[PDB]
Structures are given as C-alpha cells and as structure tokens.
Amino acid sequence: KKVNGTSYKKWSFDLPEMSNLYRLSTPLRDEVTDKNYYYLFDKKSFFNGKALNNAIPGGPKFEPLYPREEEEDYNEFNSIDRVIFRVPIRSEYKVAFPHLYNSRPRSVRIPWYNNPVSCIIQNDEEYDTPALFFDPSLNPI
Amino acid sequence: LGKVSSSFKDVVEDYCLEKGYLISKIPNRYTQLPYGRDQDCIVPLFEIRNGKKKMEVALKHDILWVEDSSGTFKPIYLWALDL
Amino acid sequence: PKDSRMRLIRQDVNLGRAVFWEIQSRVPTSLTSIKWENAFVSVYSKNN
Amino acid sequence: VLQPLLPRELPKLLDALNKISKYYPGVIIKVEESGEHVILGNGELYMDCLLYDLRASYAKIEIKISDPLTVFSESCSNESFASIPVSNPGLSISVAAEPMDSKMIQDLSRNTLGKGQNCLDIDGIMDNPRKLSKILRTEYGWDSLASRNVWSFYNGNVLINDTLPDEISPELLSKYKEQIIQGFYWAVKEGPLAEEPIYGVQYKLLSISVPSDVNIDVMKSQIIPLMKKACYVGLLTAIPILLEPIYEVDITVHAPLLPIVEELMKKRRGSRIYKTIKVAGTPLLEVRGQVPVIESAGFETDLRLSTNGLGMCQLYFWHKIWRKVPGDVLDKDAFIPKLKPAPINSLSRDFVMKTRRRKGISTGGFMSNDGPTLEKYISAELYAQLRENGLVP
Amino acid sequence: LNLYDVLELPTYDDLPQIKRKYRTLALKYHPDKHHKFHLLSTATNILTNADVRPHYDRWRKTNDIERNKLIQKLEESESSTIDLLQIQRHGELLRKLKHFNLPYGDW
RNA sequence: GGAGGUCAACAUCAAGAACUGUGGGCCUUUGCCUAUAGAACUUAUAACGAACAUGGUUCUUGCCUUUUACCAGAAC
Numbered sequence: 001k002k003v004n005g006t007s008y009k010k011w012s013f014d015l016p017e018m019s020n021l022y023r024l025s026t027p028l029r030d031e032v033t034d035k036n037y038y039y040l041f042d043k044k045s046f047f048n049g050k051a052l053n054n055a056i057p058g059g060p061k062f063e064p065l066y067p068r069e070e071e072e073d074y075n076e077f078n079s080i081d082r083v084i085f086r087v088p089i090r091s092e093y094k095v096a097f098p099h100l101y102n103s104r105p106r107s108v109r110i111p112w113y114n115n116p117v118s119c120i121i122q123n124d125e126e127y128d129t130p131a132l133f134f135d136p137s138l139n140p141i
Numbered sequence: 142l143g144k145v146s147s148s149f150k151d152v153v154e155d156y157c158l159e160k161g162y163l164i165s166k167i168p169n170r171y172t173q174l175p176y177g178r179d180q181d182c183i184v185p186l187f188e189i190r191n192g193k194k195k196m197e198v199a200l201k202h203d204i205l206w207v208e209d210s211s212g213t214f215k216p217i218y219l220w221a222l223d224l
Numbered sequence: 225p226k227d228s229r230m231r232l233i234r235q236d237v238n239l240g241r242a243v244f245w246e247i248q249s250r251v252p253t254s255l256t257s258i259k260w261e262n263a264f265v266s267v268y269s270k271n272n
Numbered sequence: 273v274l275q276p277l278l279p280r281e282l283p284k285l286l287d288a289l290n291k292i293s294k295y296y297p298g299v300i301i302k303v304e305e306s307g308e309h310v311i312l313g314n315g316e317l318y319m320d321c322l323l324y325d326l327r328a329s330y331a332k333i334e335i336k337i338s339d340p341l342t343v344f345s346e347s348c349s350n351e352s353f354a355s356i357p358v359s360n361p362g363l364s365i366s367v368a369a370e371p372m373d374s375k376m377i378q379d380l381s382r383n384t385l386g387k388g389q390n391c392l393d394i395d396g397i398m399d400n401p402r403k404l405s406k407i408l409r410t411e412y413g414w415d416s417l418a419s420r421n422v423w424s425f426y427n428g429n430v431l432i433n434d435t436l437p438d439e440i441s442p443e444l445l446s447k448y449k450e451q452i453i454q455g456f457y458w459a460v461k462e463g464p465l466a467e468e469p470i471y472g473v474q475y476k477l478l479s480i481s482v483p484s485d486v487n488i489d490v491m492k493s494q495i496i497p498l499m500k501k502a503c504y505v506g507l508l509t510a511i512p513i514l515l516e517p518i519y520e521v522d523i524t525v526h527a528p529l530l531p532i533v534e535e536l537m538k539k540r541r542g543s544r545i546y547k548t549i550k551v552a553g554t555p556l557l558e559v560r561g562q563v564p565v566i567e568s569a570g571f572e573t574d575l576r577l578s579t580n581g582l583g584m585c586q587l588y589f590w591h592k593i594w595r596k597v598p599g600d601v602l603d604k605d606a607f608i609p610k611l612k613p614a615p616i617n618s619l620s621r622d623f624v625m626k627t628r629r630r631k632g633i634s635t636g637g638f639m640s641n642d643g644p645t646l647e648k649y650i651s652a653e654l655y656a657q658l659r660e661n662g663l664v665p
Numbered sequence: 666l667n668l669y670d671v672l673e674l675p676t677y678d679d680l681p682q683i684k685r686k687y688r689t690l691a692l693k694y695h696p697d698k699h700h701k702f703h704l705l706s707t708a709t710n711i712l713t714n715a716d717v718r719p720h721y722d723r724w725r726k727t728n729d730i731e732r733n734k735l736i737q738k739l740e741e742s743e744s745s746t747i748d749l750l751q752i753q754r755h756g757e758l759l760r761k762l763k764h765f766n767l768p769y770g771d772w
Numbered sequence: 773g774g775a776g777g778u779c780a781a782c783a784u785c786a787a788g789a790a791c792u793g794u795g796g797g798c799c800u801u802u803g804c805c806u807a808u809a810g811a812a813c814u815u816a817u818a819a820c821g822a823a824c825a826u827g828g829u830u831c832u833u834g835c836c837u838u839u840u841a842c843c844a845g846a847a848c
C-alpha cells in the first residue's frame with residue numbers, strides 16, 4: 001500500500017502519517033500560508049525589476065538591460081509649467097503598474113495584481129481545543 | 142505678440158457674430174493638420190451654420206482651416222469665408 | 225541637472241544666436257574661424 | 273497625456289486610439305489644441321490595461337506618458353454683487369448666480385424618480401410645473417415664486433428667471449427661450465477659468481434687453497454668445513472656485529493594523545475616513561473614507577505594502593463628489609513652488625494656472641500669467657468703477 | 666504534362682523529324698519490350714504532318730510572362746522612388762486690432 | 773494467469789490552444805466542406821525537472837600590458 005515497489009517511485013500515504021511528518025518538519029517548513037504575502041517579491045516583480053532597472057528594497061540588483069538612458073527628447077510635452085507636482089511617484093509604484101507609471105517599458109511582464117485577503121485561523125496552542133471553535137480574534141456577530 | 146492679451150479664436154468668434162453664423166465645438170472628431178513642417182498637427186474642429194448649413198473649422202497658430210472637397214484641410218483668409 | 229540647466233525658450237535662444245551671429249560676422253574668416261559648434265551661449269532671462 | 277515617441281509614427285497611434293475607444297467603452301479620449309492627447313479612465317489599473325493594450329496589441333509603437341493627473345471642474349462660491357449686463361448694445365443681459373443647496377445637488381448626481389417622499393430628480397421637466405413645484409417647495413423650503421419661475425436645468429445646474437419684463441413681456445422672451453437654453457448648454461459645457469464644466473451653480477436670470485425693430489435671424493445668433501458671456505460674467509463675481517474629484521475609498525484590513533491605515537490617510541492630504549465597520553464573524557474591518565482624485569495617484573500600493581499584504585483598497589466614483597481645493601482661484605500672489613508640491617494655502621491658483629497652460633487658452637512666452645479676469649468682458653469703463661470699490665481682486 | 670515531358674524529351678521539327686522522334690522513342694521505350702505511348706501516338710499523329718505539328722506548337726512562354734510581370738514590377742518601383750505665411754500674418758494683424766479695440770474694417 | 777524489477781528495446785513528449793482514425797461531397801492525390809469514433813503523458817502566475825549546471829558564436833561592458841582563466845547583461 002505505502003509505495004510502488006522496490007523500484008521505489010510513486011509513494012502513497014495516509015492522513016495521520018502526513019500529520020506526523022508535517023509536525024516534525026516545522027523548522028524547515030515554508031510556514032507562510034498565503035500568496036498575498038509575496039506582493040512585489042514574486043518572480044514577475046523581479047523580472048520587471050530588472051528590465052526597468054529598479055530595485056525592491058530587499059531584491060536583487062542587476063545590470064541595466066538597456067544601457068542607454070542618455071538620449072533625451074525635448075518638447076513642450078512634459079514641460080514643468082504644465083505639470084502638477086503632487087505625490088513623489090516613488091519607485092515601488094513602477095514595478096506594480098509597470099505600463100502606467102513607467103514611460104517606455106520594454107521586456108516587462110504583467111504582475112498578477114491581487115489575492116482575496118486570507119482570514120485563515122488556526123490554533124497550535126491547545127490540542128484539546130475543538131476543531132471548530134469561535135476564536136477571540138473574530139468579531140462578535 | 143506674446144504680450145498681446147487677446148487670443149485669436151476670439152477674433153473668429155467676433156467675425157462670426159457679424160455674419161450671424163454659430164460656431165460649435167464638436168467634441169470627438171479631429172483632423173490631422175499639415176503645417177510647413179513635414180509633420181501633421183492634430184486639432185479639434187468646430188462647425189458653423191448660417192441657417193442649417195454645417196461646415197467645420199480648425200484653427201492652429203493664427204489661421205482658419207477649411208477642408209477641401211475631396212478631403213484634407215486647406216488654410217483660408219478670414220475674409221475669405223462665406224459658408 | 226535639467227531643472228537648473230538653461231531652459232529653452234524662444235526669446236532666450238533667439239537672443240543667443242543673434243549675438244553669436246553678429247560677433248560671428250565681425251571677425252573675418254581669414255584671421256580665425258568661429259563656429260557655432262564650439263560656442264556656448266548661456267542666457268539669463270526673466271525666464272531663466 | 274500621451275505623445276508618440278517617434279513623431280513620424282503619429283498616424284499609427286491615431287488609428288489605435290480609434291480602436292481603443294470602441295473596445296474599452298468607459299475611456300474618453302480627447303484631443304487638445306496643444307495636440308496633447310488626453311486619456312480619461314476610471315483609475316490606476318484601468319490605465320494600465322489600456323497602455324498595455326496600446327503598446328502591445330494595437331499600435332506596436334512605443335509612447336511617452338505623463339504623470340497621473342486629474343480632472344477639475346469650476347464653480348462659484350458666493351453671489352454677484354454686481355449683476356452686470358453684457359451685450360455683444362441692442363441686447364443687454366444681467367445674470368446672477370448662487371450656490372445650490374448641498375441636498376439638491378446630492379439628489380441630482382443620483383437620478384431619482386421621486387418615489388414616495390424622495391426628492392424627484394429635476395429630469396421630469398415635461399411634467400406639470402405644478403407637480404414639480406410641489407416637489408421643490410415641499411422638499412427644500414424652496415422659493416414659491418421661483419418654483420414656477422424655473423425654465424430648465426442641465427447636469428450640474430439649473431436656470432431661473434427673476435425680472436420685471438417677464439411680467440411685462442413674457443411672450444417676446446418665450447420666443448427666444450429655446451435660444452437661451454442653447455447659450456446655457458454652451459455655457460456649461462465650457463467654463464470661465466479652465467474652460468471646464470461648471471457644477472452646482474444656480475443661474476438666476478436678472479434681466480434681458482431687446483432692441484427696437486426686434487429682428488429675424490439676428491436675434492437667433494446674437495443671443496447665444498452674449499448669453500454665454502453673461503454666464504461667465506455671472507460666475508466670476510460670485511467667488512469662483514476649482515473642484516477636485518474625491519474617490520470614495522473602501523478598505524478591508526485585519527483589526528490590529530487599523531492604526532497603520534490611518535497614518536496613510538493623514539499623509540495623502542485629500543482624505544479622511546467616515547466609518548469603521550466591524551465585519552461580523554471575521555477578523556476584518558471595512559474602513560470607508562474619501563480621498564481626492566488628484567491625490568490618489570499612488571495610494572493603493574502604498575497601503576497594500578505598508579501592512580505586509582494584509583489589507584486591501586478600492587477607489588471609485590459614484591457619488592461624483594467634488595470638493596473645494598483649499599486655495600483661492602484667482603490670486604496673483606500665490607506661491608508657485610517650482611518642482612515642489614505647492615503649499616495648501618494656494619493649490620487652486622496652481623491647478624488653474626497649469627490647466628490653462630495645458631489647454632492653450634492662455635499664452636505666455638513660457639509661464640504665461642494671465643488670470644481668468646472679469647475685466648475683459650465688462651469693458652474697462654465699468655471695470656474701472658468696479659475696481660475702485662474693491663469688487664475685483 | 667507536356668507532350669515533350671511525357672516522352673521525357675527536349676523541346677520547328679520537320680515532318681521527317683517528327684517520324685524520327687517516334688522511331689527513337691520506340692527503340693528506347695518499346696511497349697512490347699517494356700500508357701505513356703498513348704501520348705506519343707497522339708502527338709506523333711499531328712507531328713507526322715508538319716502542318717499539325719506546327720499549328721499545335723503554335724497554340725516557357727508563360728515563364729516569359731513571368732519576366733514581363735517582373736519587368737512591370739520594376740518599372741513601377743523605380744520611377745515612383747525617383748500662402749500659409751501670409752494667412753497667419755493677416756490673422757495676427759486682425760487680432761491686434763481687436764486688442765487695440767480699433768474698429769475692424771469690413772475685412 | 774496475477775504481482776512486481778534502481779531490467780532492456782522501440783515509439784512519443786512545446787503546438788492555428790495545437791491529436792488521430794473513419795463516412796460522405798467538390799476540385800483534381802494534395803486541398804476545402806460535411807458526418808462519426810477514440811484521445812495516454814505534458815502545459816495558464818504556462819510545462820516534461822514544484823529542480824538547475826556548463827559550453828559556442830555574436831554584440832555591449834568590466835578588470836586592464838598580451839593569451840588562457842575571467843567580470844555581468846543581451847540575442848541566437
């Protein structure tokens with residue numbers, strides 16, 4: 001039942017075993033239970049970081065990928081007289097909405113936007129608390 | 142010329158008043174504009190009616206442009222307009 | 225930087241090339257050679 | 273604001289914008305005198321969806337894009353000491369204007385059929401002016417005489433008649449009424465300051481003068497532009513002002529992170545939070561608040577990061593609220609920060625002096641400084657009298 | 666497939682030459698020794714009379730037509746490759762009067 | 773005959789979001805249209821591998837006497 005054979009591929013288990021293994025492995029387990037925690041840390045935010053030559057404050061630094069910024073075009077378009085300086089347009093924004101805030105992106109990918117805001121609730125404190133219980137964190141209804 | 146407070150469009154309006162023609166903005170439509178440069182400006186256009194005739198004018202720089210019959214705008218003298 | 229660089233405005237630029245044009249003319253091309261390329265004109269303007 | 277990067281490729285970009293307008297219905301595309309193209313869309317993410325479609329699928333060219341900006345509107349605070357008449361002098365007009373009661377506008381932005389005791393939306397003009405007048409006098413403590421006096425309205429505002437020749441010659445005016453409403457729609461679609469829509473401004477028509485012999489097609493045309501200038505002139509003496517849209521922000525967070533949220537609000541400058549609603553059963557909070565449209569450029573990601581991924585935001589307009597921008601719309605002495613955010617003491621002089629530069633109405637060598645001035649329409653001679661009394665700032 | 670293609674032969678032959686062609690082919694592809702010959706018989710039928718042979722050949726040429734198309738394309742390609750100031754100025758004058766307020770002339 | 777094997781051989785595994793067979797009609801086999809049967813494995817925050825190395829050519833750099841050995845980006 002527990003495995004294919006001596007050839008040893010295709011394992012199959014039961015629930016309680018996986019519960020114990022899941023218990024033992026806590027120091028090496030991933031531990032992060034929602035997608036939404038990685039917001040600008042997924043891959044596509046890093047690629048978009050590289051192509052646009054920015055950095056997430058904890059992310060990696062690469063080379064430019066488009067070494068020449070130096071060419072500048074002068075036209076009435078962006079002139080100061082016609083612009084309103086409100087909000088700084090700081091760097092984190094460029095990676096989130098790359099086609100909007102970043103003029104002239106290239107090799108940019110679409111970042112995935114949002115997830116549903118995990119409310120997941122668990123108790124690792126008491127083993128004798130029931131499975132279904134109304135947790136003090138919740139609002140009183 | 143930069144000093145002068147008044148703006149053309151105003152002049153056009155004044156001219157129109159004497160004629161009794163009415164100038165209306167027309168929001169969406171626009172026509173590509175050819176001016177000296179090997180480039181075409183884009184400008185919004187308005188239509189003026191004497192009774193129930195509609196013709197469309199786009200003004201860039203200090204000029205009035207009226208479309209040729211086949212199509213494409215041609216600059217014209219302000220006195221040169223009679224509808 | 226761009227902000228504190230000289231701004232490009234018709235009054236300004238045209239003054240620059242005007243002055244450079246006249247002084248360009250005064251000296252004969254035989255004695256020396258004065259090209260617009262090498263020259264720098266900075267205009268201090270109400271706008272600059 | 274779009275511009276194509278390589279100018280010679282403009283004729284391609286145009287052909288893409290004719291597609292996008294179809295495909296994304298909500299988008300509104302405008303082309304200006306500057307030739308600046310104005311894209312108007314619901315928000316951050318929406319502009320992103322376009323610009324990706326516009327760079328990738330439709331027009332393969334690449335394009336330069338401005339900072340996220342907003343749309344203003346123009347209104348009047350106060351009244352019209354002056355009640356001046358403007359003639360294009362066979363026709364002499366005097367048009368007063370005053371603010372509308374907040375409740376009235378609040379019931380206009382929401383089209384409403386007056387079901388039960390609800391205030392009817394004014395859209396029922398074809399209905400009996402006695403029923404409609406019953407609605408107004410009933411709900412608003414509205415004027416009894418004006419209720420009957422009202423002619424017609426438009427999206428942001430209504431028009432009313434108070435004058436003696438109405439009592440002397442109602443018919444001769446009833447001829448050209450349909451002319452005056454044209455001048456009115458023309459008046460509202462543009463504006464005195466930024467040439468942007470007028471909103472919440474009640475126009476009471478004080479007077480109209482008509483020439484001898486009358487006319488046939490002279491009275492047809494000559495009325496519209498003069499009526500327009502009568503509406504601008506009516507406004508500019510009322511204490512005019514620059515309106516900025518306010519998003520109704522809706523936020524959802526875990527409870528203990530509530531303080532963090534609050535900080536962000538205090539930073540934005542537009543906005544404050546009306547409500548904090550416990551969500552029964554879940555460890556969540558709905559925080560309802562408001563922020564200006566022009567201030568909201570980066571809000572969402574600010575929030576979503578700052579709380580470490582717990583939490584959320586949405587920005588939306590329904591109510592189509594608006595609010596005064598804390599400056600005074602016409603002032604020469606406002607401080608223009610030049611590359612800094614202006615001090616709240618004057619933001620309105622800023623926004624208008626900018627939009628004016630964008631919409632090519634006002635010409636300066638570089639920074640034109642021409643105010644929307646009442647003076648131009650009156651003629652100096654009246655103007656000189658007006659300035660003596662401190663009427664004009 | 667051309668009659669020449671069917672016989673696997675190359676392209677003004679005489680009535681005599683027409684006979685000789687068949688004779689040569691007969692030696693090579695003799696049916697009694699080794700459907701194709703049906704073509705040979707028919708074409709030979711007209712080719713054996715010099716008149717029919719000539720008329721039949723009268724009606725590579727098409728390909729020449731290809732050359733003509735190429736030439737037409739080349740001709741099209743190579744040959745093809747090989748007041749405003751006054752107006753705006755008048756408008757500028759017209760605005761100046763409006764500014765100065767001097768009455769407009771009847772333009 | 774059933775279970776297996778740290779056994780082998782031969783097929784197949786990156787594409788019009790995509791496979792194959794068969795029935796019928798048109799052109800003259802291909803191809804198009806229509807009808808019907810079955811589709812293992814791999815793919816949507818895209819892929820056989822919930823993992824992750826090296827080499828070649830060509831550009832751009834970086835160290836900087838020159839070559840191997842190299843710096844870090846790209847395309848194939």
Ligand SMILES: [Mg+2]
Nearest residue numbers: 837838839840
């Ligand atoms: Mg050597």
